[model samples]
Every structure is written in C-alpha cells, then in structure tokens.
Target chain A: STAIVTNVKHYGGMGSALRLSEAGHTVACHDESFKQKDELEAFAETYPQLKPMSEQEPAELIEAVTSAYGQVDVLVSNDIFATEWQPIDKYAVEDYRGAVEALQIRPFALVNAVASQMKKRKSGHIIFITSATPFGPWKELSTYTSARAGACTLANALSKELGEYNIPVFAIGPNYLHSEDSPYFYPTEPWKTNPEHVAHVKKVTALQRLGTQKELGELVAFLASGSCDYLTGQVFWLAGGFPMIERWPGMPE
Target chain B: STAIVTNVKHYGGMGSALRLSEAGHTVACHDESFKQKDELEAFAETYPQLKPMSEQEPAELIEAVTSAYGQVDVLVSNDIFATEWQPIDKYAVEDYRGAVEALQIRPFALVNAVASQMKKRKSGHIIFITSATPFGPWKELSTYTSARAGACTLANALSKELGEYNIPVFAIGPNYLHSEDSPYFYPTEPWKTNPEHVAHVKKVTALQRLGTQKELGELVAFLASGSCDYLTGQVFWLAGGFPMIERWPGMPE
Candidate 1:
C-alpha cells in the first residue's frame, strides 16, 4: 500500500513517512518548498520507497501523487492551522483573517481536492493533523484555536459522508510534541528540550514522558493502514494529560 | 442603557431586540436591509425606545448606533453564522467559503468593532446569539457547525480579554427556538408551527414543548442586564433538550 503524507518538514510527517516507507509502502512526503532536501535524502537512503514532493495546491499534489503511486491508499492532510497565540483584545482582526485563511480555508480546499478522489474509489483513508488546543480552549490562544477548531471539524462532516463508501476520516491532535515548527510540535525549542522542561513535560503527561515522533509516526501508520475502519470523524488527543486548567477556567486551577 | 443587536431580521435578533426595547434600553435593531420594517415599527410603537438601523459593515453600524445612543452599553453581536446544512463531500468548497464569510468572518469583524468600544469604556456587556448545533454537532451540518462553532468560540477569547475591564462577554446558543432565520430560528416554517411538527418538537425537547421568541428575548434581556458580572464566556443552551443522538453519533442514535 502507498501513502501520501503532507508536509514532511513539519508536524509528525517525517516519522510517519519514515515508518510507512520502511513498511514497504511507496510514500510521497510533501511540503511547500521541500527545502529540507538533506532530510528527505537521508530518509530515501534509509528507505528507498521515500518520495519527496513540493507543491502548494492540494489538487496538484493529489494528482501528482496518484500519478506516481498508482493509487493513493491514504492521504494525511497536514496544513498549518495554528499561528502565534495571543489575547483576542490585542490580537488584530487581520491576524484572525490570516488564521481563517490558513487554518480553515486551506484545509477545506485540501479535503475538497482529495475526498473527491477517495469518494470515487470507495476505498481510501483521510487524516487531518490538527491540535489538541481546541478540545480544551486555552486563554490567549483564541485566534489560533478558533480557526484550528474549524479544521478539526472537517473530519466530522467527512466521516459521515464518506462512511458509506468505507472511507474513514480522522483528526489526530498532537500537543507538547517536540518539533522544529515551535513548542507546539515535536523537535521544538531547545529550552523545551532542556532537562528542566523535560521534567515539567514528564510531570504533565499521563505516561510521565514526552511522546517521540517515532511513536506518533506509528500511530499515524496504524490509522493509515486501515486497522480502525470503524472509527470515522473522531479526534485523537495526543497530549500527555496536560491540565486544561493551566490557562483555562473550566477546570479548577 | 442602550443595547445594539445586529441583524434584527435574522436569527433571534428580533426577539432579543424587542425584549431589550421593552426593557427600557434604547435598542438599536441593525441588519443589512431592515427588510422587515413592519416588525421594527411594531416594536417601536409598543416600546417607543426601539431604534432600527440598517448597515452591513460592522464598523459603520457600531458608529451610527454609538453616535445616536451615546455608547454601546451592550452589543448583541448577532451575525448570521449558519447556512444550508449539507454533507461535506457533496457540499462545495464555495458554500463552505460562504459559511466562513458569514459565520466566522463577519462575527469576528462585529466583535472587533464593538469590543474596542467596550475595552475603552471598561464597562459593557457582549452577547453572541449563535446556534446550539455546534455543542452537539449535527450530521450533515459540518459546514454550518464548523463555522458556527468558531463563532461560539469567539466569546471564550473575548470574555478573558474583556474581564479585566469589567466587561462581560457571553455566547447564548438557542436551539429549536422560534424566529425567521430558518427552522433554525423562530418564525420559521409554517409546517413547524402546525400541530404535527409541534408534537414532534415536544417529544424531542426535555421540557416537552417548544420555546418562544419571547422566552429567548427574556434570556437575552437578563444576560444584558449586567446582573451576572461574575459569569463570562460561558454558553447558555436554550434548547429544552433536543437529543444530540438525533443527528449525531456521539450519543447513541
């Protein structure tokens, strides 16, 4: 089986693509610039099935991936939805518009492009990698979450409509993961990777440890593998039990 | 006290505006066209304090209302946030764009216009009359609920930011309420008013009955009365008890 994972440079795409490639699946790892050629090259060396692609339009990407891979068994729509977190009062409406553009509109376009393909086949999987912030609204993060939440909701509609065709749509939310994108992703800030931050991260998670990209990749792999075809339009929270109360009023501080 | 309610012709704006007018607050009933002039005239005749202003732009509406009434003590930022509900796959990206334009973008603009005044004065009340559908996302309502949910979330961010200035912000979600917006609103379809539909509505709601615009009006009146300064950014569900299971999978269908 072949898998199309969006944005290998960001989110948990790298690990997922790596796992899928190693699992003997032809993987098209896509991003905007594919500027991280060194990363893709290394992955290709490790797993010959790795294929890196750079394209912005979802339709173009889907068309290209499908043309090369024979069939797109899975599509991981990984568009960036969250921007800088800020209080609504100080946050400019322009920024909110930007968030709406990036977080809400782009994903809708992505799904529109890919779902049509999947719908025709009656056998494909779609996953949107969003954030856990929406499940628990955080203070000073409204602009980001408002639009991000809408992105998460895409699966809700997709699953029901695609279910008859056996196409399962899911939203995977990863929080406190180490990423180069920011503290919000895996391989984040050095300060977060420091010993003190690791201790704090460990304390907050139910597992008493930060989740690695490898683990996140495995989870993505399982979902893409059609293991849980019954699950559709559901959100999987990947945060380590970090208290919503820290910046929220719902839970007792 | 002067309260400005946007879109008097749509949503529950008619009820809220009428209630505010009757409550002795110089109420500004705003919408794009004010197409329903007779309704406003009737309210003005009955309550004398009603002021109907039609302006599409949020800034222009706020300006005219504020200039005439001195200050916006309360802003019932009622923008149309939901549109025709449909499944995600068949639903066009254009329709989703429209929903985002109406539901997500317009409300943000309205809040941006009104919140600045409240933030400056350090004393005001803000209420968003959105749908209760997002609380329990209805199937075939992804486009409607996705953007609608973002509108509801506007208060969560606003309440915290405005709390420092003693300005309270709230989101009041009315379900199965009487209005003219759609079956979604009061004064909707005549079929809904017929006995058969009424009986169906009764069975679905926990209260064993449908809710009137007058009831919805009173709730808005209470929220705008500055009595619950302690409460902010909380959602008040107006539906009697429509089962979430009816259109959702979370609750057993």
Candidate 2:
C-alpha cells in the first residue's frame, strides 16, 4: 500500500488522492485534524481501496509507512494552509509564515525523511503539488511567494542531486485547479477558473483546458512507474500553458 | 551620470568598475575598508571623470547611489568574501553564511532598495556576477551553491518583473576568469588553464582558453549600453564554451 501524507481537510486533496487510488494503487490517506472526519470517512468509503488513516503526527506517519511498507514508493506533499488573500502591509508576516510552515517547509521535512529510505532502495517518486506561479514576485504576500519559490528551487535542486539515484522528484505546477474544494478557495460567484474552469484552460492549453484530476493522476502514476525511468530532474507544469516556456526560457525559439 | 557600485579591493571587481568609469559614466566604488582608496585614486587619476568615493554600508551604499545619481543605471553585485574551506559539519554556519551573506543576500537587499527607484525611472540594467556553476550543484560547498543559486533566481524573477518597465536584468556566467588578485582560479601550470589559456581553450571553446578581464569588461559594458535594450530577463553564459548543458560527471571532451 502506498502512503500519501497531506494536511488538507477533505474535497480537493482527498478527491485527488482517491483519483490516484482508483488508478489501481491502494492509497493510505493521512491528514491532520478530524475537522472533516465524517466527510473524509465517506469519501474514503467511496473509493473502497482508499484507507482513512487517523491523524497521526508527521513523525508517526513516516514511522508507520516505513515500518509497514519497508519504504514509501511515492510521496505527495500537498498541504497549503491559507488561501485567504490579504494585500501587503495589512498582511502579517506571521500569518504568511504560518501557511508556509504548515504547507511547504514542513512538507519538505517529511519528504526528506521518506526520501532517504527511497534513496537506499534505489526507487521512488516524490510529487510536490505546489502553486502555479511559484517564480512570480506577486504583490501583497511576499512571504508566501518567497516560501513557494524556495520550495520550487528546492525541488529543482534536489531533482538534480537525486537523479543519479533513479529517484524521480517532481513538483507539479497547476493554476486554479477546480476540485471538490475549489468553492472554499473561491467562495464567490463568477468563481473564475474553478476546477472545471481549469479544465477549460487546460483544453485551451498547449494540449488545451485545465488538466483533469485523472490526467494529473496519470502523470504522477507514470513517473512513479518504471516507464519514466530515464526522465528525472524536472518540475512539470500541468497548468495549461502557464507563463509557459515553450523551450527553456532564454533559449531562442 | 550612472552609478555602478564595486568592492574595489578585488582585482576583477575593480577592473570592471574602472572599465565602466572609462566608458563616460560616473562610477560608485564602494568598499567598506579603504584598503584600495589609494589604488582607486591612482586609477581615477587617469580617468579623471571617475568619481572615487569610499565604501558605504550596504544600505547606505544603496541610498547614496540613488540619492547621488537619481537612480542607479547599472548594477554589478561583486562578491569576494574569502573563507577557510571546511567540511559541512565543521563549517560554521556563520563563516559560510558570511560568504553567501557577502555574495548573495547582502547584494539582494542592496539591489532591492534601488530596484524600486529604477522601476520609477523605467530604464535600468542589473547584472549579477555570480559563480558560473550556480546551475551546476557544487559538492563540498552546499551553502555557497545554494546562495549563488538563490541570487541567480533573483535575477530571473526580477527580470520578469522589471522587463515591462524597460529595465533589463542579466546574469553573466563566466566559467573561469583570470584576474590579477588570483591567478589560481583559472588553471595555471600543466593542470592550470591560465588567462592566456584563453587561446588554448579558445580552440575548444566556441570562442577558448580562460577568459580575460577585458573580455568580461567589454561584455558588461555592451550589456549595460543601450544596444542591449532587447536583451532583458535572461542569463547568458560568457563561458568560452564550458558546455554546461551536456557536460556530464567525471568526463571531459
């Protein structure tokens, strides 16, 4: 059984987790907080193979996964705390730091713990489902932008380091993904670019419309599988032609 | 009058600053220690137009340049902090931090202070004289690599942000440069490819041998000049031909 650790309540995170499980891999879902225990259990039940593991501390989760599976074959680090937008100045550094701490930095620590084991085993895939414009210097929340950028860099740097070990590390960049939890993030009408809206964007993308959850799941599964053995050291974007680099940026077209 | 800051004690840094001064632009020679005050004065004696000012604190340097010149026209963040090489465990975070602090974050803060001013002016040039191998992960000096990598990213992100303002940001990645202060950075003796080695390397280089100080100065001057108006938001390796893209581990062509 593959273990997926996250800090999301339900909907988007769990829904995506189930999609992966549906692809014939048994996924053990771990999230902190029982705030959505009923919803989570119901969600987990729909995908019979998806096991709802109770909220265990991150350390305990790592311990449980490694002890049961010998090693984690794949890790999906996706736990973003705050999507609430606040412009700069009125923005508190602590609030921004809190989101990064809960989401990016801490998740990296968890990946580090499991990744070492994967290195020893000589096989594994770590997917960081992070923000789309990780490189942008967006106005207002500088701290979050800083954290996400750092996380993206870390993914790139680590992929460079870990490629030799045959361990593929990927950070998928998706913009305004519409999942079950999109309503919570948007919370208003004109819900511009809901998960479905993402589908529209992905369709218009280089491939076209936002990518479907299943499509994303397939990409992750492919990297995890032996087929993508030679391809490593990459942060693939599923955000349908984001400030997309057709070729590596700066390289003449 | 364009302000260009420099840590003049370092030969490469001073040479570039002097070259900029000679090109009919006002220069800002910033070195915390006045160790090179006499040398700069002697050098400026010839350029006469070169304004030799003692080094200011990083923040003060930013303020002085903006205040004196209205806004900085060209920036070359030169880093030359020396340190005793030690393994990661033995390496004091403070000592390694100083290398990066001098090379990375300090320059970042200084440039950021002037960046807004440049944006208001709507035209500027920023260049990071970072290590050539910031893209290639260097073993035994993880911190140094990380800092350089961070600075490189800063250039990229800033380029995207400032491009709309007609301000251009570029990174000069010189594989091995020869300077008077350190003949050893470039290969010397049988193992060394000295500055004059540029001729030998030139054969292998798409141009080769080690690069000369004048070559770099010419490149910088050209980039800062109005001719490079379209060359915004990119890192162009001034590496005669190091072949970073295809260069693999433990192999030489």
Question: Which number leads on TM-score?
Answer: 1
Model 1 interface CAPRI class: acceptable
lDDT (10s digit) by residue, model 2, range B1-253: 5857566545356556767767866777766454467765775675565555654665667777767777678887766556344333344435543654555555565565667677777887888776655555443444455445555655665676667778888767666566655432453443243445544555445544567777877777787887876777567676676643446698764
Compared with the true structure, what per-residue lDDT tens digits does model 1 show for residues A1-253? 7788877767777777887777767888776656567765775676566788765576787788888877788887766654676655566778888887777777777777777667788888888877776766666777777776777776766677688888998888777766655333545665356888767776566666666777778878888887788878788888867543344567532
Candidate 1: count the clashes. Answer: 13
DockQ of 2: 0.11
Clash totals for all candidate models? 13, 27
Q: Candidate 2, which segments miss by more than 4 Å at Cα?
A: A7-16, A23-70, A79-112, A130-153, A182-208, A243-253, B6-12, B30-58, B67-71, B79-108, B131-150, B179-208, B244-253
Cα lDDT tens digits for candidate 2, A1-253: 4747464443236545656676665566776553377866775766567666664566567777667656577777765655544332233434544554554455556665676677777777777766655544444444444445445544665666566677776766555454444442322233343566544444445655344555656676676665775666566666666544456667853
CA lDDT of each prediction against the hidden true structure:
0.74, 0.59
Output the TM-score of candidate 1: 0.87
